[PDB]
Amino acid sequence: TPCLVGGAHAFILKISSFCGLAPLRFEPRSQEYAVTISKGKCFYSYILVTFLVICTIYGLVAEIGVGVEKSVRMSSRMSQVVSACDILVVAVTAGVGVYGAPARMRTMLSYMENIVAVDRELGRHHSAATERKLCALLLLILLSFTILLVDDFCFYAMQAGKTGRQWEIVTNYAGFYFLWYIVMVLELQFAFTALSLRARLKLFNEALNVTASQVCFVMMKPCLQVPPCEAVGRLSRMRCTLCEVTRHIADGYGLPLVIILMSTLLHLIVTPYFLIMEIIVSTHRLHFLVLQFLWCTTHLIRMLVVVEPCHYTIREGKRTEDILCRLMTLAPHGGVLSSRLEVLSRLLMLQNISYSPLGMCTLDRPLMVTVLGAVTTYLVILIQFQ
Amino acid sequence: TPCLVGGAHAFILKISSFCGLAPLRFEPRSQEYAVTISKGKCFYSYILVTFLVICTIYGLVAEIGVGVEKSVRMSSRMSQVVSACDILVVAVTAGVGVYGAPARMRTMLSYMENIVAVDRELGRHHSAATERKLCALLLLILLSFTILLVDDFCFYAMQAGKTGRQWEIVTNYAGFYFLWYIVMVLELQFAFTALSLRARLKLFNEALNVTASQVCFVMMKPCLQVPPCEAVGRLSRMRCTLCEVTRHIADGYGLPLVIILMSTLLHLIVTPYFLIMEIIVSTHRLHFLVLQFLWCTTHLIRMLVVVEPCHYTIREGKRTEDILCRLMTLAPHGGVLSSRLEVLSRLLMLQNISYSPLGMCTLDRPLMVTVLGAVTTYLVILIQFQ
Amino acid sequence: TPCLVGGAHAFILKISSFCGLAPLRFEPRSQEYAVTISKGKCFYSYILVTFLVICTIYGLVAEIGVGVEKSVRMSSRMSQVVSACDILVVAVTAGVGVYGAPARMRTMLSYMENIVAVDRELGRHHSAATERKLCALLLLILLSFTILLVDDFCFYAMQAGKTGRQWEIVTNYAGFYFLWYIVMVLELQFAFTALSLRARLKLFNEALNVTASQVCFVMMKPCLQVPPCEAVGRLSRMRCTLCEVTRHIADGYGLPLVIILMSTLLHLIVTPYFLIMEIIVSTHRLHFLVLQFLWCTTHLIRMLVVVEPCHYTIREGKRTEDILCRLMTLAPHGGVLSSRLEVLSRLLMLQNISYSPLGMCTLDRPLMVTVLGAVTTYLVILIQFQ
Amino acid sequence: TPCLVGGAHAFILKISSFCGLAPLRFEPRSQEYAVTISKGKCFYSYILVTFLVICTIYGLVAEIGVGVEKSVRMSSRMSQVVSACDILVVAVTAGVGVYGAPARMRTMLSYMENIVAVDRELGRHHSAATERKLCALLLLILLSFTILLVDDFCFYAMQAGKTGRQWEIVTNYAGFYFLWYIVMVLELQFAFTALSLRARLKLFNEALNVTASQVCFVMMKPCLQVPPCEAVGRLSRMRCTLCEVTRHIADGYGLPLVIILMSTLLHLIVTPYFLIMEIIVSTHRLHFLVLQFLWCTTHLIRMLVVVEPCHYTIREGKRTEDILCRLMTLAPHGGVLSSRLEVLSRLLMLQNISYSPLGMCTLDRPLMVTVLGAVTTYLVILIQFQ
């Protein structure tokens, strides 16, 4: 039993296996999957991302060296630089996601053993219904993004079909759109790893509330098998394990998350800018305007997908703080349970469960307020000049 | 005795009952009101807000589809978009306030039972004089806003009366102004709920100071019935209850408060902008200038109404920290009271009483400095171009 | 012995007594001064500030109603509004400083009794040499500002002497410059109150370090009369007293400090703007350029005078944290001194000594980085247009 | 044995000895160096920096008083002011670095005695391989900067060689480039001092993890000689020593670091601005464009060199918090080790190991996000006008 991963977390692991973001061998256990590092899939991922990056660079050069008037996607020198920056940052995100995948998956197994131990101590992580709901949500997001990407590709190819270069744009941007798909699959993978960890933290909070209830294999499906004195110690150990796992996830996904946030800034500055520039000046294009609106919505959705599970984890930490306070008010004053609650309070004060990619920022809802605050500041400056 | 609400908090609950923001059945108890969820008032609120939103959308379309020169309120394409955004955000705020009211009122009763228990343990929340003062302040704010709304409506109707469409503007903006009234009634409701909770927290701090005084049904109107050892434990339990209630209030009002803050940003950017544009270019209109000044003052007052009770609650938390420190310096060093104060200090360090709508920001005076700091930055950029 | 104030804190109290910012009766005790609230000086302060504000408003109207070309200080419509805002904010600062002085002085005596108790327990606050140095620094700052104000008045009067209105400018701006003097005297008063409190906190830290040294009326001029067990408790009580006094000072000076910070923002935005506008376009005036440079330096010095004592107090708090950590590493592990250090650590964690005017901001060096960061942002925007 | 410094920290001390930033006498001990303050080197440093500053001021005047068209480096009035500000801030940084060096080196010895004690208690700080790696990295950075400086000097001299003033630019900028070298050597010196301290902190964390492992001269190369009860107390004392040393380093380097951060802001605003201005308008110069790109990269590298060791120290503090939490979950509950861990937790909560130059800001990765956030805001404003 090396890893024994399952649920919606293992669904995105199989999906990202083909994208190169999870080079694992999936052994079905009729309930979950036992995943191990495979060198064949690692080599496949490396060669796939290298080929895609080479093709993307070649297409960027071919769309830059053609000129300005002849190119369809790029129509100005400023548009050439910003589109080149977009392509380069997307390629960098994909390269960080795929090249760093085998190390990330090794870390994943390394903390998944402890996650398996914690789940055994608590009992399950999700019900079947909510696991199916999460899988359906992941599939809906992935299919929506894939449909938008295909529509954008088809629109930009048909627009170039009037000139005659209907295949040149395809050759220049197939790798770019594959890299887009890889980047969003990586975003979904991080989001669902964080969501599974947050579910485990929620179960830990439920166990604390249960040992508060004093009904009387710590948790069963409620009641409490062990006395509250040792249950609190076991829960403190499990919370330290969860903190270690959250730190491991943040370390594994820090660089991709930072580059994704930078890409989100760039896109939320650029796509609304050209969307507005195509409104006030002259629309003349329903499909382009609809695509730009959908791309703005998709960038906002990607930022939300990145941020929201981290906010939920922080909220679960606040909830366990509240539960611990309610515990400390109760319980015999001089008893041994009170000192266990004191130790748990010291643990809660010393370390908290949060996501800080590379330490530059804290993934939470206040971060997206700063992002949208900066985006509007640049947009107000940029738009008012034209 | 389901809820037994009373005072200035129950005054805004009866006022917001007709606006649809509090679908409760008010049973007078000759001292307070026993409020329960009523399905008839819930349906009335839902149909009222739906009708108002439909009428507002129809009026927005009719004032947009008429043109630019013919419309009185909107005189440019840029003015059409910003006024449409204003109407849409006000309608969204009203819809969130009214559609989410029955859940908010259920939460209100759910923590009001604990508030009743806490008030019974402490004794009262306000005197009659200060309750009358708070009711008078609420009535003054509501009447000032209603007078300003009526004056704005009358001015914009009489201005359109020259052209001949004296009734078209009325039909297009009656729903909008009703939604304005609903939004400010919701703001007042949140503010006075927070004020009542802050009064309870202030009474808790007074009880801590009394158990410090060591004079010797915890609090009476001073002295202390129970010994300070158990009084501190009961006060710790009551503070945890107050923290839970504050969290419930923040959860109930988070989305409306966030949208209200966004509307405050938009209005403090737009209304001063047009006020200045009507000053430097040409005034020619005393009534319009006075109305714009009054609207800027009203937006600032609304932001203050939102923020200020939260700042007072935070100040009460700081005060209880200071009282606890003064307690810990006193009291026998090795006694059981010292350990109770240790537990209370751990509670104070672990959790604090604050308002964080949706977790995006903390409602406090520093927040309004950031708001006014951003408002001036946009205004300096926007004004200097013209 | 009502108050018994002395030193550089009582030097600015006698200076601000005539400005109306300290309506106290100074009874010399041959070592210090026993100050009490006097109704005669309160009435004198009220009538003086009312007369000065009335004269300032009259002069502002007379310099606005004259026109644009004829007025010397104001040469444009934009210059009329910004100079009017400057005069109004200075008058508001002076009115808040003088009208709120009697309450501020009552609070001053109320915490000065506890300061006297603390000084008796510790022993002195400053040596004679450093008290003379602080008095000399205060006198140097006051004389520098007075010389700059007199030079500015003389320059603006002589410039208007060419036209013939050599006395109209004097009549219109005498009250304004008196209000300037009052505002800076208030700034100096707050700064030196904070400096005296910081000196007391530094002596408290020295006493903690001494009880760490374990040499063996707590502090003498070193050694320790009482055993370290009770010395730490007495020091904890004294630190709570110092925290209460700092909170009282912040409450007394919050509104004046907030308005002073707003004035500092406005002046650091406006004076450099016109200084640059008089450089790139055409200088033609050495005296005006020198005066503008000196006024920029004076505004920076005023901001530093406001911020710096608060930063020193925060640094003293950090120092006492470090001293407490060093104490906790030492001392017998299971002894009673260890538990006293535990209580002191809980005090240090629960509350800290800081200045937060009205709760909107924290007076510290990071605040002035935000101020200068915002000032340059507006200056970069404003200057680049011309 | 006065100091006994060695490793990569003593490599930059010998390099900065000639630049005047470390006036020490290096006595080889066949393993390390025993460094003492030398008055001869102090006088040499003072006269060297004074001569360089005088020459820099003379060259700035000669390049300003020549005019605009004739000067090669400066081609406009705006370019004259910004280049003068660059030269002045670099000269101020060099003067603060060299004039304050003897005090900084005295502080260095004062905490290096305690560092020697801590290293004796723990055992070593770096292996030979990693010390050689750090020396190689320092040499690579220094040689890269020296090559860039020499190339910039040669390019600007050859550009002026067409006119005929091939030696005037050399005479005017030799002192400026020497000051550049001094400033970056000071940056490297601070960075490597911080890196050595961070290595010691990492060894302290390793010792805590070892006393967690419970294998059983505290640390040996693993196992633990002393029982965990007293090992934790000795580690707490060592952590307080490390905190004192970090505070001493921050105090010594605060002003140079603040001026370096200001210079980084100025350069990251100015060099990209002219780099873009030389791209959109007309390039016509490959060497100038390459030099501007390299200078932008060098400014970013200098900011990273300043910030990164501080971020690593903060990360080590977070790691010791996590290790302490894991310790507190383990260990007998009522034993004496638990109370030692309680004291260590109080130490960790009261004080943390961080770098705050002058208290204005905290050196960490979030700081460089604010720096780059402000840099782009000014660049977006400035670039869009042209």
Numbering used by the authors:
A (entry chain B), B (entry chain C), C (entry chain D), D (entry chain A): 14 to 229, 271 to 275, 281 to 445
Could you pull the original sentences from the published paper?
Insects, instead, rely on a distinct family of sweet gustatory receptors, which are tetrameric ligand-gated cation channels. An extreme example of sugar specialization occurs in a conserved subfamily of gustatory receptors founded by Drosophila melanogaster Gr43a (DmGr43a), whose members are selectively activated only by the monosaccharide d-fructose, providing a unique opportunity to investigate how specificity for a single sugar is achieved. Here we investigate the structural basis of sugar discrimination by Gr9 (BmGr9), the silk moth B. mori orthologue of DmGr43a. Our results thus indicate that receptor tuning in BmGr9 arises from two distinct but complementary mechanisms: the stereoelectronic characteristics of the ligand-binding pocket; and the engagement of an allosteric process required to activate the channel.
To gain insight into the mechanism of receptor activation, we also determined the structure of BmGr9 in the absence of ligand. We resolved a map of similar quality as the fructose-bound BmGr9 but with the extracellular hydrophobic gate closed, consistent with the absence of any density in the ligand-binding pocket. In the unbound structure, Phe444 side chains from each subunit face the centre of the ion-conducting pore, erecting a hydrophobic barrier that constricts the pore diameter and prevents ion passage, similar to the gate observed in olfactory receptors. In the closed state, Gln443 hydrogen bonds with Gln445 from a neighbouring subunit. In the absence of a ligand, the vestibule connecting the pocket to the extracellular surface is approximately 8 Å wide, large enough for sugar molecules to access the bottom of the pocket freely. In the closed state, Tyr332 and Phe333 are exposed to the membrane interior through a gap between the S7b and S2 helices, where additional columnar lipid or detergent density is observed in the structure of unbound BmGr9. Nearby, Arg90 in S2 reaches across the gap between subunits to interact with carboxy-terminal carbonyls of S5 in the absence of ligand.
